[PDB]
């Protein structure tokens, strides 16, 4: 029904992490610096700036201070320090108030860096968003 009037896009969440040796381990667990960024993929699979979002909010574990962190410019890079991975929620806000999407992400220390792809459905009823969507594929 109402979901017919949408296009799909794949976004790629990019995570990196490494130990900070100058930070005392917590219960023998080392503290790590970690970062998350978000890019968009085009129809050929190349990364391009995710300009279809005007805001990203990382909803961090409540062991973090001010755990809801807003970013407004691609690639919406967040950097933090911690000791244990966790599911976090990433809210991405489409241009022109076209809608919030909540992307589940798993922050973990299994790899130095790892990328995860998510498909979102985006409406075609906001002119400025529709023009932006043309940069990443058919509309």
């Amino acid at each position: 029904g109402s979901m017919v009037a949408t296009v799909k896009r794949t976004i790629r969440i990019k995570t990196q992490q490494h130990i900070l040796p100058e930070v005392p381990p917590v219960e023998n667990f080392p503290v790590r610096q970690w970062s998350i960024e978000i890019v968009l993929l085009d129809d050929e699979g190349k990364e391009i700036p995710a300009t279809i979002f005007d805001k990203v909010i990382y909803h961090l574990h409540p062991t973090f201070a001010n755990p809801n962190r807003t970013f407004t410019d691609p690639p919406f890079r967040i950097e933090e320090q911690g000791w244990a991975g966790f599911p976090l929620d990433i809210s991405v806000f489409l241009l022109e108030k076209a809608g919030e999407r909540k992307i589940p992400h798993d922050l973990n220390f299994l790899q130095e860096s790892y990328e995860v792809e998510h498909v979102i459905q985006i409406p075609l009823n906001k002119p400025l968003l529709t023009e932006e969507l043309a940069k990443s594929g058919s509309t």
């Binding site: 244990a84 991975g85 966790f86 973990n108 220390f109």
Partner: peptide, 6 residues
């Protein structure tokens, strides 16, 4: 590398 929060 498998450290995780509750």
């Amino acid at each position: 590398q498998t450290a995780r929060k509750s």
